[PDB]
Amino acid sequence: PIVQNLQGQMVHQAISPRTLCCWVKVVEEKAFSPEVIPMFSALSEGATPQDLNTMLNTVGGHQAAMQMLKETINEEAAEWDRLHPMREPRGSDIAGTTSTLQEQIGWMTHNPPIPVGEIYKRWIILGLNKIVRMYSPTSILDIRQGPKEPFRDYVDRFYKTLRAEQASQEVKNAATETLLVQNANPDCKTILKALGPGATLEEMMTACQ
Amino acid sequence: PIVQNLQGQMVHQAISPRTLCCWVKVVEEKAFSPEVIPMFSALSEGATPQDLNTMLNTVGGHQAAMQMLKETINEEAAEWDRLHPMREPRGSDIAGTTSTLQEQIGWMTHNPPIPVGEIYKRWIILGLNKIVRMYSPTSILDIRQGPKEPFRDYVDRFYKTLRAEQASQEVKNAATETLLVQNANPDCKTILKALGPGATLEEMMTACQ
Amino acid sequence: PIVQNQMVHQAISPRTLCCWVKVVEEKAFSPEVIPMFSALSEGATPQDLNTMLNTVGGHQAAMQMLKETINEEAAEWDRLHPMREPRGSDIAGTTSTLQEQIGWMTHNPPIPVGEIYKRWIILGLNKIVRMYSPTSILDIRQGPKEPFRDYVDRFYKTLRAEQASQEVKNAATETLLVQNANPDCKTILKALGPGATLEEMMTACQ
Amino acid sequence: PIHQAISPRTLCCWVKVVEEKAFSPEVIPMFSALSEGATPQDLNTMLNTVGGHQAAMQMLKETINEEAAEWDRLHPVHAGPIAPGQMREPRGSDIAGTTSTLQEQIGWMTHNPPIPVGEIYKRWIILGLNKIVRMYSPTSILDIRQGPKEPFRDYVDRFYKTLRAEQASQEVKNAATETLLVQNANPDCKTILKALGPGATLEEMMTACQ
Amino acid sequence: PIHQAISPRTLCCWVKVVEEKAFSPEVIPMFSALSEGATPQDLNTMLNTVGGHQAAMQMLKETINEEAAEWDRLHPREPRGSDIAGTTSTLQEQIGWMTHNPPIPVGEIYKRWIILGLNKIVRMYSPTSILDIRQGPKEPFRDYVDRFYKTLRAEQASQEVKNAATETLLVQNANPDCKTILKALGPGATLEEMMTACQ
């Protein structure tokens, strides 16, 4: 990654072991649960395209997803080239495949900077979103409380599904206002209507325990 | 966070990987056992609202709780606006949604400081308390020693339950004095009466091993 | 904690806290928890020590006893010693501020509230380790089918839990160890004759 | 590394990773990332702390021996004296850190211009790891066929894992994707996949067969 | 170590490793890497924080006792045996000896005693002779080779003995199918070639 020295100038640590080992552990354990994405962001502050590739190349298993992620990176690089045909970085320079660590550093610490790091990062995040959406056990079409299901379990699947579907804040708000109550089992749904409007999720969960 | 360096000066570091991995591991394993709270405090010394949001967004599962926490944060932000209508921070500036890292640092290091990190922290702790109280719902009254249960295991449940209800030190003392002996199984209860009043927990546990 | 760069104050580090939490959960209150507590708590303020205590999960019976021991030692401190002077509860960090705690610890001459709180906590930890391992060294006898190594592990674990002085440990080895072995091993061990090292003894019985 | 001594966090992660993952192909970039700036002595500590897989640690040792011998053949001592500020030339075994001192290793690596013994040893080690990764995963890409009841994702995971274990060139990987992937799908999936027509992304194909 | 006090990251990793691996041979180079620059006090902190294995910690203590006595006999302030094992000396004395010029490296000396004791324990905890290691009839050749070399490592076999065991026993003690395949390969076969032939 790139960091400024005490003197204020832009230099460069190599990716630290603590970072890598945390990243590796997290991807293993969580598979592609939606929280993997903000984790990836937080672990990759200031990363060069070379650090980003080390992160992708050290994930074990999930080769189907790593392969899709590679396709999405290819589609975004091609797209970058169409819109923007030392030297100027091509799409592949940004994904760090046809560029050197030295070139990458040049661009990132230039003034004004070309943050190839940040650009590659958005392509990776775009690929992760797709993979999180594919991997979710759950879907939009199926979100109703089971007849015997605790209200808390159902609320967990409801929000877990929203987060994975990458619902827009409007859609999330709509689903909270409507569905949550609408798709509850009849016992709970009845209790919930009695609370009347303006019921907090806290009040609703307390009412149905 | 904004922590003091070895030289005693106040600095902005980005949230460290070691902090994040510990935090994520802890929340996973412990769910919302009461000790999550002092752990969250200790992990979030000097946090900016942006570091706090990273912590919240990297939690996996428990979306019902994350969603309640988000409601609590919304109620406190609105409340802050009612009492307080560079620039002054609004509710959403304190929750880090409408504000920049540079504004957040500005406010926190200003003299006199406006401690947005600390303020946001208290809202989050409020929401964690409600969640801890919901997730461990069994009343101290229903905690009774099983007929074959070792006295230590029962004492463990008793104090774990008390902690989860955030009992005031008075209430805790009252529950020890009353409920602990009272709800022991008959064998132990009998042994414990023989010891008489003013028995330390140590004496009591020794008597029933 | 307070470390030298001059004496400065760091907040308790995450690496420290996660290790500490891990160790206490895995090990329960095996005797090695105590030197581990000491090594994790170098330079700790009473506020750091309370974070260490409050983050333990489970073992609430034990944490509750430990709290009682702390209460007894604080009261005792008040009886012998009635900026400001620290009361018992100031040392346990409940009625004192981080800034006061630092004040006391770096004053000249220093009032080492950290170190003082630390010994109260260690005292409580010793009691808990002894309770969680209550079997007397005298009742440690090799099972009829128990490998000699396992029995020797329980024997010295037990001695350590009683915090036996090195003299006492040597005396127990010399006396009690062969004595309480199962008859097969006990027989082999008598044949070895006196002056046998623990290594020789364990080799003979594997 | 360059001089700090190898850090505990590094060593613990390294040991954890090699235990858990065995010799899955990702072990190699992991070894690289963990060994930035490493001296030959740091590299030996990494290899000596691996537990288990002694068959593999033994092969790795042989590979290291062959590469050292090979180095000697292409750089025998240049004859004659060593000027001051200068030092001797490293032989094969100096690079593998068996006949050299920490002090010498640092000498060579920080000299100007540098002799990067760390990097050279590292390439031998990586050569050895590649061989072991390929042995621990010997099934050909050609024998990877979707089970009759196997989810399409699982099969795709084996397919690309296998390709990675053979260190296939990007051309070969592309060729195998284009040819072999649909071809070796079970009949249900294979049928669905033909219907999709050409230019189907791996995403589209996995969606279609779930 | 040299003066920092022993770091938590160091201690936690050490404790974790000893717990999980018991006294597998690799514990030794791990102990060495974790204890670079250690004072006798840091070394005692490492020994005192091991949980379990009290038979072994007790034998280790006896070996330290024998080596301290032996030190005294050969070198009768100057550090006595117990000063080196950090029992009768202070942190500040230990720092004195170690940074003196010329140095008396009490850290390093104590370290060798501890390693001497660890080797004895590793040898006792992995007692099976190389001779008793034979490929099972259905055992994959790689698993057998793993046991073979793990066993040799545990016995601290001299490089001569290791070579002899490779030359003889490895092929010799293979199951009959593999042993046959291995004879066909002829001499000068690399371990790689041998493992490939028997997979």
Instruction: Examine residue D187 and say whether the peptide bond preceding it is cis (omega within 30 degrees of 0).
Output: no
Experimental method: X-ray
**Helix or strand (DSSP H, E) at B2:** strand B2-4
Q: How far apart are CA A108 and CA E186, in angstroms?
A: 58
Residues in contact with A31: Cβ distance below 8 Å, sequence separation at least 6, in sequence order: A62, A135
Is A26 part of the contact surface with chain B (CB cutoff 8 Å)?
A: yes
Residues of chain B positioned with their CB less than 8 A from the CB of C134: 209
How many other C-beta atoms can be found within 10 angstroms of the C-beta atom of residue D141? 19
Residue E76 corresponds to which tokens in the numbers above? 């009768």
Q: How far apart are CA E13 and CA E50, in angstroms?
A: 11
CA distance D102 to chain A (A): 23
Is E163 part of the contact surface with chain D (CB cutoff 8 Å)?
A: no
Q: How far apart are CA A167 and CA A169, in angstroms?
A: 6
Cross-chain Cβ contact E54/C30 below 8 Å: no
Cross-chain Cβ contact D55/E24 below 8 Å: no
Residue among C8, C57, C127 minimizing CB distance to B35: C57
Residue C79 corresponds to which tokens in the numbers above? 């009886």
Query: Rounded to the nearest 5 degrees, what angle is found at the Cα of E196, between the Cα atoms of E194 and E199?
Result: 110
The residue of chain D with its CA nearest to that of E142 is D55
Q: How far apart are CA A85 and CA D86, in angstroms?
A: 50
Is B87 part of the contact surface with chain A (CB cutoff 8 Å)?
A: no
D170 burial via Cβ count (<10 Å: 0-12, 13-18, 19+):
exposed
Residue among A42, A160, A162 minimizing CB distance to B15: A42
Q: How far apart are CA B159 and CA C201, in angstroms?
A: 46
Residue among C26, C198, C206 minimizing CB distance to E58: C198
Q: How far apart are CA C81 and CA C86, in angstroms?
A: 9
A:B CB pairs within 8 Å? 70
Residue D29 corresponds to which tokens in the numbers above? 């970039």
Using DSSP, state whether C9 is helix, strand or coil. strand
Residue among B57, B62, B130 minimizing CB distance to A38: B57
| Alpha carbon of residue A190 to chain centroid | 37
Q: What phi and psi, each to the nearest 5 degrees, are found at residue A165?
A: -70, -5
Q: How far apart are CA B194 and CA B184, in angstroms?
A: 14
Query: Rounded to the nearest 5 degrees, what angle is found at the Cα of B74, between the Cα atoms of B69 and B77?
Result: 125
Is A14 part of the contact surface with chain D (CB cutoff 8 Å)?
A: yes
Chains that touch C (3 or more CB pairs under 8 A): B, E
| Alpha carbon of residue B29 to chain centroid | 15
Cross-chain Cβ contact D58/E145 below 8 Å: yes
The residue of chain B with its CA nearest to that of A203 is B68
Q: How far apart are CA B94 and CA B88, in angstroms?
A: 10
Residues in contact with B200: Cβ distance below 8 Å, sequence separation at least 6, in sequence order: C65, C68
Is A198 part of the contact surface with chain D (CB cutoff 8 Å)?
A: no
DSSP code per residue over D84-148: TT--PPP-HHHHTTSSS-HHHHHHHHHSSS---HHHHHHHHHHHHHHHHHHHHS---GGG----S
Strand (E) positions, chain C? 2-4, 7-9
Cross-chain Cβ contact C57/B163 below 8 Å: no
Residues in contact with C77: Cβ distance below 8 Å, sequence separation at least 6, in sequence order: C87, C88, C91, C116
List for chain A the helix, strand, coil content (%; round to 5).
Answer: 60, 0, 40
Residues in contact with C80: Cβ distance below 8 Å, sequence separation at least 6, in sequence order: none
C-alpha dihedral sign at D22, D28, D29, D33: positive
Using DSSP, state whether E135 is helix, strand or coil. coil
Structural domains of chain C sorted by starting position, each given as residue range(s) with its CATH number in brackets: 1-136 (1.10.375.10), 137-206 (1.10.1200.30)
- Count of CA atoms in the C-beta half-sphere (13 A) of A53: 18
Q: What phi and psi, each to the nearest 5 degrees, are found at residue A106?
A: -50, -60
The residue of chain A with its CA nearest to that of D14 is A21
CA distance B45 to chain A (A): 18
Residues of chain E positioned with their CB less than 8 A from the CB of D5: 33, 36-37
How many other C-beta atoms can be found within 10 angstroms of the C-beta atom of residue A95? 25
Which 8-state DSSP code applies to residue E149?
H
Asked whether the beta carbons of C153 and C84 are under 8 A apart, the reply is: no
Residues in contact with D139: Cβ distance below 8 Å, sequence separation at least 6, in sequence order: D162
Resolution expressed in Å: 2.5
Asked whether the beta carbons of B59 and B66 are under 8 A apart, the reply is: yes
Give the β-pairing of B2-4 and B10-12: antiparallel
Residue among B26, B160, B205 minimizing CB distance to C131: B205
How many other C-beta atoms can be found within 10 angstroms of the C-beta atom of residue A119? 19
Q: How far apart are CA B174 and CA B140, in angstroms?
A: 11
Residues in contact with B120: Cβ distance below 8 Å, sequence separation at least 6, in sequence order: B49, B52, B94, B95, B96
Is E50 part of the contact surface with chain C (CB cutoff 8 Å)?
A: yes
Is D146 part of the contact surface with chain A (CB cutoff 8 Å)?
A: no
Buried b (16+ CB within 10 A) or exposed e, B20-42: bbbbbbbbeebebbbbbbbbbbb
Question: Which of these, A87, A85, A91, lies nearest to A107 by C-alpha position?
Answer: A87
Asked whether the beta carbons of D128 and D28 are under 8 A apart, the reply is: no
C-alpha dihedral sign at B115, B118, B120, B122: negative
Residues in contact with A146: Cβ distance below 8 Å, sequence separation at least 6, in sequence order: A153, A154, A185
Using DSSP, state whether C1 is helix, strand or coil. coil
Q: How far apart are CA D70 and CA A101, in angstroms?
A: 30
C-alpha dihedral sign at B23, B27, B33, B34: positive
Question: Which of these, C48, C37, C34, lies nearest to C2 by C-alpha position?
Answer: C48
- Count of CA atoms in the C-beta half-sphere (13 A) of C62: 24
Cross-chain Cβ contact D34/A57 below 8 Å: no
The residue of chain A with its CA nearest to that of D161 is A63
Residues of chain B positioned with their CB less than 8 A from the CB of A152: 64
Select the residue from C24, C64, C102 to test the B interface by mutation, using most B Cβ atoms within 10 A: C64
Number of separate helices (H) and strands (E) present in chain A: 12, 0
Question: Which of these, C2, C109, C7, C82, lies nearest to C46 by C-alpha position?
Answer: C2
Residues of chain E positioned with their CB less than 8 A from the CB of C31: 51
